[PDB]
Amino acid sequence: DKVLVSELIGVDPNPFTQRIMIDKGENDGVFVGQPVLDASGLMGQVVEVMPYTARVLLLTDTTHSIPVQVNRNGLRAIAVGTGNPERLELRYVADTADIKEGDLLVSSGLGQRFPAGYPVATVKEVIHDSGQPFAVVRAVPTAKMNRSRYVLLVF
Ligand SMILES: [Cl-]
Ligand SMILES: [Cl-]
Ligand SMILES: [Cl-]
Ligand SMILES: [Cl-]
Ligand SMILES: [Mg+2]
């Protein structure tokens, strides 16, 4: 309910991370695990808190996964980071699933880490794989990620 507005003050230059720094911390009530989003998508979660600043792991990090669903039909999937700043991939989507380019993915909340129903990404590509149970699904985050103005922290 309470939303704190923070500024993105750093992008972790480590090429192997998608990680940012924000200008709110312990003194502002920020906590580890806290969800972070912008006006068009979920961004990720707080992973470390300092007195007036914090570190945030983005959805696009290879170590990050978020349960999602296709907004229009409720089809469930896990969206993993690819290490690319503007790409996610969906796991566990049946090769024959009702999914297509332009479909909106929203948070499902099924991991009890993120609020349900918020935009996460749009499907970019579906690639079918003969003999494999799951389709290849690439998606683009709707958040501005390493480019957001107002980074919002949900209480
Ligand atoms: Cl904490
Ligand atoms: Cl949709
Ligand atoms: Cl990628
Ligand atoms: Cl979740
Ligand atoms: Mg980095």
Residue numbers in the entry: 100 to 254
Paper text:
The elongasome, or Rod system, is a protein complex that controls cell wall formation in rod-shaped bacteria. MreC is a membrane-associated elongasome component that co-localizes with the cytoskeletal element MreB and regulates the activity of cell wall biosynthesis enzymes, in a process that may be dependent on MreC self-association. MreC is a bitopic protein that harbors a large periplasmic domain, whose most noteworthy characteristic is a β−sandwich core reminiscent of ‘butterfly wings’. MreC is essential for shape maintenance in rod-shaped bacteria, and mreC knockout mutants are not viable.
In order to allow unambiguous tracing of the MreCPa structure into the cryo-EM Coulomb potential map, we solved the high-resolution crystal structure of MreCPa(97-258) that harbors only the central β-sandwich core region. Fitting the refined crystallographic model of MreCPa(97-258) into the cryo-EM map confirmed that within each protofilament, monomers are ordered in a polar, head-to-tail fashion, with the β-sandwich folds contributing with complementing charged regions towards formation of the interface between two protofilaments.
